[PDB]
């Protein structure tokens, strides 16, 4: 159904866009949603890295 990707939290995303954050699991954004394609995903629980990177959030720094 959904092609899932390669690397681990970059999924199917059919909204893409912004994300969440170690400290803002939502992001404000005027945005809408980026066309359908391999990205994070935030409504599961996976933040970007200060280094622009989608990871766990357990995966977070300490």
């Known amino acids: 159904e959904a092609e899932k990707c390669t690397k681990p939290n970059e999924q199917w ?3 893409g866009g912004c994300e969440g ?3 803002q699991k939502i992001v404000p954004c005027t945005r809408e949603c980026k066309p359908p394609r391999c990205e994070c995903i935030a409504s ?4 970007r ?3 622009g990177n989608c990871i ?3 995966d977070c720094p300490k």
């Open 13 to 15: 995303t059919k909204c």
């Open 49 to 51: 890295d200060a280094q």
């Open 56 to 58: 766990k959030f357990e």
């Open 21 to 23: 954050t170690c400290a």
């Open 44 to 47: 599961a629980g996976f933040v």
